[PDB]
From a paper:
(G) Cryo-EM structure of the SARS-CoV-2 RBD bound to the C1C-A3 antibody Fab. The trimer model shown was generated by superposition of an RBD–C1C-A3 Fab model generated by subparticle classification of the RBD region onto the coordinates of the trimeric spike protein–C1C-A3 Fab complex. In agreement with competition assays, A3 interacts with RBD residues that overlap significantly with those of CR3022. The R346KRBD mutation falls within the RBD core and is in the S309 binding site but is not within A3’s footprint. Although the A3 and S309 footprints on the RBD do not overlap, and S309 (a class 3 antibody) can bind the closed spike protein trimer, both antibodies contact the N-linked glycan attached to N343RBD but approach it from different faces. The A3 epitope is highly conserved between SARS-CoV-2 and SARS-CoV; however, N370RBD is a site of N-linked glycosylation in SARS-CoV (N357RBD in SARS-CoV numbering) and in animal coronaviruses but not in SARS-CoV-2. An N-linked glycan attached to SARS-CoV-2 N370RBD would introduce steric clashes with the A3 antibody heavy and light chains. Structural superposition reveals that the N370RBD glycan on the RaTG13 RBD is positioned in a manner that may not block A3 epitope access but could interfere with binding of other antibodies that bind nearby epitopes on the RBD core. (E) Overlay of the C1C-A3 Fab–RBD complex with the day 146* RBD–ACE2 complex.
Numbering used by the authors:
A (entry chain A): 319 to 541
B (entry chain L): 1 to 95, 95A, 95B, 96 to 212
C (entry chain H): 1 to 52, 52A, 53 to 82, 82A, 82B, 82C, 83 to 100, 100A, ...
């Protein structure tokens, strides 16, 4: 009836890779305050293309070994797109302080997700700087996790409110990055994304790859 | 696959001067190439990563630049900790891996000094063991490139003798070379005149050292 | 104390296996990635293997794809590296290396290197050197010895200037050889007696002979 071990088998074969190029390889990202975000679902999330692409720069992921992730399947993948100052890259992490952590982006703590970033200087710049990216300097308090504010409402350092028109101390919220094709490494434009893996008590998940194996026939009872 | 292309093949210069090496990568890598400095026998140590970041333990005299497929390192003032070999390395996706370069050796200028050629006839001691060996020695020459040919009845023997060169000694900044031919005893008896020819930039004409015994 | 020290250098026949180890110290082992880079004699550096800081996924060069095993056990803070199906080219100075980046997956730079351990492969058995004979210069040529190292001296090191000791090379017989020479003034030729004292520690074959024309 039964037979020696080796006859077990896997792979109810499927395929259909999904839009991770369409977020990593976008021709243009939005800035920090206007950080882009998008739902990804009903696909196999192949990260074995993500790791081994040797064109990323400061690639880490918390809370789970990604290689072990590839079996563990989550849903509601939602991933980001924005760009940061060269130095500031490390500061996008759980429970970290700084300037982005307060006024432009706060990562939820105990976050088990990924932060993937990189250097991009070859395209996100031009002679004199590509002034298409801005960041916030003021806000009344800290930010919640994963929320946005785009607004012309301004801080009032003094007592008298600034009635919309910038003045000596209005401090109009948005200021732009000055990127140069010659500036230092710490000041390069680091084009970055972030994924979060939120399965918010949500049936009908959508799972990922499990690479292969090659059949051997005419051996019974084991599957 | 990225295969690193290093120029110039070697550098020779006096200390205190400006040494600029180039590493042109095969295809674009943005900002990711790193420099490794290995003295002879020592442990290689990183100098530059990200192609302009001066890694820790690196005095400020070390500078590098470039991105895409142009990458070059500059040194303002060489002092003896830096006369070494040097490599450029970076990383790859298909198949995932890492490619080093070929290496770039550094040499000291001094007064070009021609060789003293010597030839050492085989000893009967080796004949007691049935093998014959002969060494032709070249002493105190510069630059590294040089050439040695055996003549036994004018026959040039190649692929039968191993030549080794010592690394540049500290004192006179010179080199030494020596090549040992290994020969079956039968090939020892078959002739009686054995000679070695030297051809080098320091020599106006080829220099022959020879003997007649067997 | 921030160092790596390798371990396991040796000689083995082709087709058999050896496993090395690298000891780490002065830093958090389980937060950085580790690499193995091998430096074949007389050649440049060739990356062999890597391991992520949690060792959950690993990469191997093509020349060792499916033949070597990289693994880290943080219990002893020791990195390892196994070998299987070794062939002649594998002779090298295996430098265990440390990743540059802290808790990053990129694994692109080697920021700190172990001293490098010799590893050699051949069918030859250990055998002591045969030191053989031969202004004006002279010395003794050292022949048919295996493995390294051999330390040469003139008159038990009495003289060191104008002395050349040459790199060992591998000949097809499966052994090594080198030679050692020194220049002396022509007038000194008959005046002063020269004895070449040579040590080969692994076989402790201490043989010393005079050079006389
Ligand atoms: C953002 O944009 C980036 C650039 O646009 C992009 O990077 C690119 O990512 C793709 C991902 O698919 C990657 O393509 C892979 O290429 C593998 C190797 O082939 C390349 O690359 C090597 C070295 O780089 C070259 O030697 C090859 O020739 C080829 O490059 C070029 O080829 C063209 C056409 O022949 C030439 O004109 C060019 O000259 C040449 N370049 C050079 C420099 O000479 C390839 O093996 C991968 O597919 C295989 O993957 C597995 C092995 O890794 C196999 O198991 C699998 O089966 C695949 O095999 C076959 O692939 C065929 C591809 O055409 C399919 O048709 C077959 O169907 C398939 N087999 C089966 C059974 O189905 C893979 O295609 C690029 O190399 C990479 N390039 C760069 C510069 O980065 C990023 O990915 C983008 N982002 C994101 C998130 O994706
Ligand atoms: C299972 O995975 C395979 C991998 O691509 C999917 O592709 C196709 O599989 C079919 C199986 O019938 C192959 O059909 C035939 O293959 C022979 C030999 O290769 C070929 O000569 C014939 O012309 C015919 O195509 C097909 O080749 C193969 N695709 C390609 C491009 O070769 C398959 O769809 C997956 N199955 C399921 C149920 O998802």
């Amino acid at each position: 009836r039964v037979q020696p071990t080796e006859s077990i088998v896997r792979f109810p074969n499927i395929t259909n890779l999904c839009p991770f190029g369409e977020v990593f390889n976008a021709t243009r990202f939005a800035s920090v305050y206007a950080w882009n975000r998008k739902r990804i679902s009903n696909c196999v999330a192949d990260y074995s293309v993500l790791y081994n692409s040797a064109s990323f720069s400061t690639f880490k992921c918390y809370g789970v070994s990604p290689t072990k992730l590839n079996d563990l399947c989550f849903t509601n993948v939602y991933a980001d797109s924005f760009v940061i100052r060269g130095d500031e890259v490390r500061q996008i992490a759980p429970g970290q302080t700084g300037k982005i952590a307060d006024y432009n982006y706060k990562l939820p703590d105990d976050f088990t997700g990924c932060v993937i970033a990189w250097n991009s200087n070859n395209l996100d710049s031009k002679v004199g700087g590509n002034y298409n990216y801005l960041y916030r300097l003021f806000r009344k308090s800290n930010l919640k996790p994963f929320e946005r504010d785009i607004s012309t409402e301004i801080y009032q350092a003094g007592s008298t409110p600034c009635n919309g028109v910038e003045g000596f101390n209005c401090y109009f919220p948005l200021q732009s990055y000055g990127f140069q094709p010659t500036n230092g490494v710490g000041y390069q434009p680091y084009r970055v994304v972030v994924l979060s893996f939120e399965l918010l008590h949500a049936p009908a998940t959508v799972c990922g790859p499990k690479k292969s194996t090659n059949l051997v026939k005419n051996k019974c009872v084991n599957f | 696959e990225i295969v690193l292309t290093q120029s110039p093949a070697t550098l020779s210069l006096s200390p205190g001067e400006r040494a600029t090496l180039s590493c042109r990568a095969s295809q674009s890598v943005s900002t990711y190439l790193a420099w490794y400095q290995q003295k002879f026998g020592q442990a290689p140590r990183l100098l530059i990563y990200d192609a302009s970041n001066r890694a820790t333990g690196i005095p400020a005299r070390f500078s590098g630049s470039g991105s895409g497929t142009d990458f070059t390192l500059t040194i303002s003032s060489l002092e003896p900790e830096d006369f070494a070999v040097y490599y450029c390395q970076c990383r790859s996706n298909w198949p995932p891996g890492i490619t080093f370069g070929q290496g770039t050796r550094l040499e000291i200028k001094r007064t070009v000094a021609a060789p003293s050629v010597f030839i050492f006839p085989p000893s009967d001691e080796q004949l007691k063991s049935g093998t014959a060996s002969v060494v032709c020695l070249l002493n105190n020459f510069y630059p590294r490139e040089a050439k040695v040919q055996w003549k036994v009845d004018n026959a040039l023997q190649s692929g039968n003798s191993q030549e080794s060169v010592t690394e540049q000694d500290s004192k006179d900044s010179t080199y030494s070379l020596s090549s040992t031919l290994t020969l079956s005893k039968a090939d020892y008896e078959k002739h009686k005149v054995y000679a070695c020819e030297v051809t080098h930039q320091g020599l106006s004409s080829p220099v022959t050292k020879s003997f007649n015994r067997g | 104390q921030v160092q790596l020290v390798e371990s396991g250098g040796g000689v083995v026949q082709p087709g058999r296996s050896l496993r090395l180890s690298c000891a780490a110290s002065g830093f958090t082992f389980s937060s950085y990635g580790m690499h193995w880079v091998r430096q074949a004699p007389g050649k440049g550096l060739e990356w062999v293997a890597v391991i992520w800081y949690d060792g959950t996924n690993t990469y191997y060069a093509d020349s060792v794809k499916g033949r070597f095993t990289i693994s880290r056990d943080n219990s002893k803070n020791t990195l390892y590296l196994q070998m299987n199906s070794l062939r002649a080219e594998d002779t090298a100075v295996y430098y265990c290396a440390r990743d540059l980046a802290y808790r990053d997956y990129v694994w692109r730079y080697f920021d700190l290197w172990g001293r490098g351990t010799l590893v050699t492969v051949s069918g030859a058995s250990t055998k002591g050197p045969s030191v053989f004979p031969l202004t004006a210069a002279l010395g003794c040529l050292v022949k048919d010895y295996f493995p390294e190292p051999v330390t040469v001296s003139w008159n038990s090191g009495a003289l060191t200037s104008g002395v050349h000791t040459f790199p060992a090379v591998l000949q097809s017989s499966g052994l090594y050889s080198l030679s050692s020479v020194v220049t002396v003034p022509s007038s000194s030729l008959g005046t002063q007696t020269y004895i070449c004292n040579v040590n080969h520690k692994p076989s402790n074959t201490k043989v010393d002979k005079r050079v006389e024309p």
